[PDB]
Amino acid sequence: AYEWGVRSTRKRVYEIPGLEPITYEGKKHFVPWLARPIFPPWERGWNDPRFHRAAPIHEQTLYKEEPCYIFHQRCRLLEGMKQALWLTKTKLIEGLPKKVLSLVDDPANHIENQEQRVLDIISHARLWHSTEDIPKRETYCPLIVDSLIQLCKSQILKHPSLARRTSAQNCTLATTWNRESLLLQVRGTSSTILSAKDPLPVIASREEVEATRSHVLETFYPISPTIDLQECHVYEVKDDTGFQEGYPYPHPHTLYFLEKANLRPQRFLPEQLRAKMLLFAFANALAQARLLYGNTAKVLEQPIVVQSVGTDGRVFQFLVLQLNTTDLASSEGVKNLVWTDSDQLLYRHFWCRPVIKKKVVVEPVGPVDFQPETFRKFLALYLHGVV
Amino acid sequence: KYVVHPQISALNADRWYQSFTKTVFVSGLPPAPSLDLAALRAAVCDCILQEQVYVRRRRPRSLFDRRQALASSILDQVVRTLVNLLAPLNPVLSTAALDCKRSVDFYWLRGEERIPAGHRKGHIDALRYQINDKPHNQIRISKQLPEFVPLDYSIPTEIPVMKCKPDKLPLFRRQYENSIFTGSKTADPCCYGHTQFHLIPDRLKRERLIRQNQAEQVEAVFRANAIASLFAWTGAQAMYQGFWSEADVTRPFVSQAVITDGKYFSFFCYQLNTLALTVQADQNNPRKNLCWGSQSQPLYETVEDNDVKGFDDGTLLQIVHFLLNKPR
Amino acid sequence: GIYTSDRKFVQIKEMVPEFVVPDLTGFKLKPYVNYRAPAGIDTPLTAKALFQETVAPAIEKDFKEGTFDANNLEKYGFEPTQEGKLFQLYPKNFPR
Amino acid sequence: KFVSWKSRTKYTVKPVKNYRMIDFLRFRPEKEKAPEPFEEKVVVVRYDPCRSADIALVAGGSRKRWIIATENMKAGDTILNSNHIGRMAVAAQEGDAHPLGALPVGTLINNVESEPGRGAQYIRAAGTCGVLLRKVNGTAIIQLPSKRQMQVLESCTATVGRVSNVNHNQRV
């Protein structure tokens, strides 16, 4: 039976006026035969954090009646891609930018023994790195990406211009903007941000930027755009690019986000990762525009281009975002342009120990169905803007 | 078996480690393409020293790891950039493998003891030692480094001798798996290495040690970590080649490591000549292991505003000089 | 010290005793005394003796002069409260 | 000193160390909706360790909640929860929660509540079905598994269809 009310609870002398009942307060200890004293509130003389209690939200000075919705890593959008596009006022073009694809077409871009080196790195990242027989994704997933970046970073010999960019750690990105009168905030942190001294080349011309006015953001009535976001009544308006002002590499080249959870239920779905990347990538791009052009709302004459790569060590997702407007109050008008490449598999499966069936080595200790094309797509993004 | 900590606060721990390792520690460095040293004075990335003021990150909850966390971030970034910057000059760096906070293990036997009591009283047992280290960074290459001195090189200096038992100095024995590791499995092609990087904790830093009255032990901490880390790391490499106690190495194994307290930087070079350290295997062995170390030197003075003042190129030159070295 | 969260010991400097060591240079008192020195008959000090030695002369002179009042009881040595002193007579808050 | 084991602070559909928190108030207005009829999807028909009948996960809007499964609930089915008393007969899909006024006489029902807002307390066992014996204006007769026929207001919520394991009463 459904219970209304906690189931746990389910199965004279003082009145005299002008006189005070005697109580064991004088005794300084409880005795059943004496009346319970009336105790005024106790004062410790100092504040104990262990016994301290946080004040209620409404009493906070920063409390605001309007709700600020904050998006963080754990947030999972119910509508996935559709909600992200509406919130970020961006127009989606399938596939990577035409320029990015052409980067790896150049023979010089291709690394010498690129597939073999990736295969060796994959084997090292999965097996040789540690003494454990079967290392888990929590360990090799950070390692494989770092090793791949070093291999890509080794291309500075071919292209000295690559020396103008560096990667930072635990960069925090945050912005606040309004969509159709709805207050939206995106908070992103962790991972790494590749930054270069020069902005990434604009993918779409000003004429193309104006053409985005025709595009209309898709709606999903009656579910509100603020679904799955953290509703906040105590908040502060902030814009963060991951670095304080004065950074010599103000332009972020790529925004990485790694999902190293070993278990699939513990791992965000591919759609959710891209949705998280879109908001986080949009926030970083928006912060750059706000710093450069101030807090005014207007269509950006010079679009800002930023990239994001999300991988779990086996599946790789590549995202490129171009910020075309800062006038995000309206849902119609110039829209940001985003290029999406999803479900790029480095390898279908990897065996960390030899698989012997009927005294036959069916599977070696190496990646299964390894696809060097995925690394090429990753290589294209890294080299983009330099070659 | 005895558990050996590469970083330990025991007095004369380097001397005790040398006795267990049969290593002689000679003070100073081992006997012996322009790149704009001034460009590397800044290409070494004072930018990460600039980024520690710019790169925003969630504040540590402890409030004590803030200082230590900062040192790790700068060192990792500096190592990454330096490898890329020095790659064109030295092709070895291109083929090298970089290891971050990975474990190096070595298991060796030196000496013997008589059981004093118990059901096995009087029985003879060897003294077992295990060294487990996790260098902040180390570089693994597929080719052996050039020797700094020919094998069988002899010097008048004598290895330390310990009067008391190992247990008298704080040390405890435990029974667990014996492991010899080079930082990666034998399948990894890079069975050799270029350099090893170590970071001293705050507890062992100069300021606390001086307050604790163990100012003289600052160099000992540097030496103990260097000798333990390099010997264990070098010994594993030789075993990967098939050389063991009864089959001593036919070629000297050499390695170098750098230990920093966060400001000061020290350089150490180790050469492994003997794998026969057991009483039986070392019964008649004239060869001995040799280690060369240098005093810790500041790499800079302070970092105010958004730049670094007082950077010392000399320490960087040793890193540059070390990195440029390649086998002949 | 105090053990904080995470099972981590946090030594408290205030709770760590500091040994106050007297200066023995120029001090003529030693562990033993002469057999030449006569033994001392025990005369334990009492509140009456302490009051008589120090407080009585002040009040006696003041009372004859007439300059005696309740407000000036502290002048003769009364302490209204033990707070403010490092060593509090009652409740005893100081170690030997 | 007794604290019930059903002490989870937050209602969740994930198994709890497993036990899944069931919801017996079928018409609880979900988030981002007015107190008006709303629809839900039967995500999965799972097994409930603590109840004889199997529980079907019913999901609508932004809220996911476990509910008791009727005879023919399967994955992907559509479940409607209405408070409005239909002027005409309301479309009846097995497992839907509608006021007894909307339903016509003779429809098998389960998870009925004696009083409006009480929540499902009867016909929650396997093979138990309540017959709507009579319907007059705002009053209806609901036969509970105890064989007690009771008269309740049309506002009371009743779920159409018999409970899962239709042959529970026929077990031999």
Place this chain on the structure above:
Amino acid sequence: ARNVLYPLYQLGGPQLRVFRTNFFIQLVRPGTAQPEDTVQFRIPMEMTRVDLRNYLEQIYNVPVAAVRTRVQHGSNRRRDHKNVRIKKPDYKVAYVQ
């Protein structure tokens, strides 16, 4: 000081000062073989190793580098003429370098 009550400390409270010390220690020839700098001491079981460090540094002006301490269990096997177990007083051995 032993067998005495120590003042309870609260935030902002005074530093603890022991003007008179009841701790008494004895220097003992090491039973085992120890380094020459290492010294064995028998100290009251209520004394901490930090207390010994301050004790030697302040009272005797002795510089101390490292301290290792052990608690020796007193054998209770001994019995009297009435067959009543006699317990040896437990003592703490401190190895001070």
Place this chain on the structure above:
Amino acid sequence: GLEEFFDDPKNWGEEKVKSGASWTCQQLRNKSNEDLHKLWYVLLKERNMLLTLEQEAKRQRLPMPSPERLEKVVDSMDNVDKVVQEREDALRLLQTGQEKPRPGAWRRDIFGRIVWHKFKQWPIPWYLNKRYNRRRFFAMPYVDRFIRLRIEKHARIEARKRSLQKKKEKILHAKF
């Protein structure tokens, strides 16, 4: 100093060490408060040296020369403590009138006996301290039977004592 832990090298090997009488209480009272604190450490230093020598003698299975020295030092130290305590006690009584340094009161245990309860300092008050309230300072009703037994036991003790004296008296008459 390390030498202070040991006896004079000249005295080593001597049958005894010449030492005088211990400090008497009156002489310590004559000494100043600062002098008393200084003297305490001086006595303690000698006591530790004598204790240090004695322990080595136990290890060597040898007698301690002039063991009376330790007794004299201990007697002097004991005299010092009471003299200092006397001055502290007198002033506490004058300023506060309390006969005990620690707050306390008479309380009844669960056995019905009346015992002096020494108060403990807490950061919280008694009414907010459930554990202190959990401590029982009340006597159960069944203790009335025990109270009668205690009175009877006291009478029984006197009766048994008389019997013990009687047996002793028998020999007195027999002997005399």
Place this chain on the structure above:
RNA sequence: AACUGU
């Protein structure tokens, strides 16, 4: 049936 110190 064989087998065997039954």
Place this chain on the structure above:
RNA sequence: UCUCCAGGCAUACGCGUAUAACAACUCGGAUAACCAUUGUUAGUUAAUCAGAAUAGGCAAUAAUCACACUAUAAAUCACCUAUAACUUCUCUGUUAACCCAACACCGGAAUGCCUAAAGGAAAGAUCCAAAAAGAUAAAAGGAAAAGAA
């Protein structure tokens, strides 16, 4: 040194000085030697081994080398938003041939590693009684080998 046997080492639990050295030869070992006995003295060393703040917001998708792949017994705090605190290494465990069974009881006694490099000794001496017990061998023969029902 030789001959031969083949569960050994750590932790848990329990035990609580049975540990080690010296000195004893009375008592304990169901006999000696020697100690496990008697007396006395000594012992086990840890920043790494082990033990000893608060209020809100929000969570669909097991594992099995987890990829494919199915299945049924249905199989996992985090992170955000605020509040509070602000510089730390003391205390305790560490010996042993050891415990539960009245006993130095042919019994009972968890886990990890390994299988001899670890760990051990069936012979107090003599005699070769009968009778009895166990083991081994059987000429011819086979109920006076492992096959069928």
Place this chain on the structure above:
RNA sequence: AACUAAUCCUAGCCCUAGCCCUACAAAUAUAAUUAUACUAUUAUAUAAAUCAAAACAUUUAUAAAAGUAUUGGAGA
């Protein structure tokens, strides 16, 4: 005249009389004896039966008048 053993007097008690009684430190009811917060804190219905009535059932004691009268399976 020998062995094993034996030898002893106070160790103390018993009943009345008399008499009511008002006899270190440190740690502790938390896990008693754990130097500071946890977790609120709490005994007890006729006394019965056994037993006697040779079992068992109502029932069965706990100054003189006087073991008179009554009561009682009129019986203990």
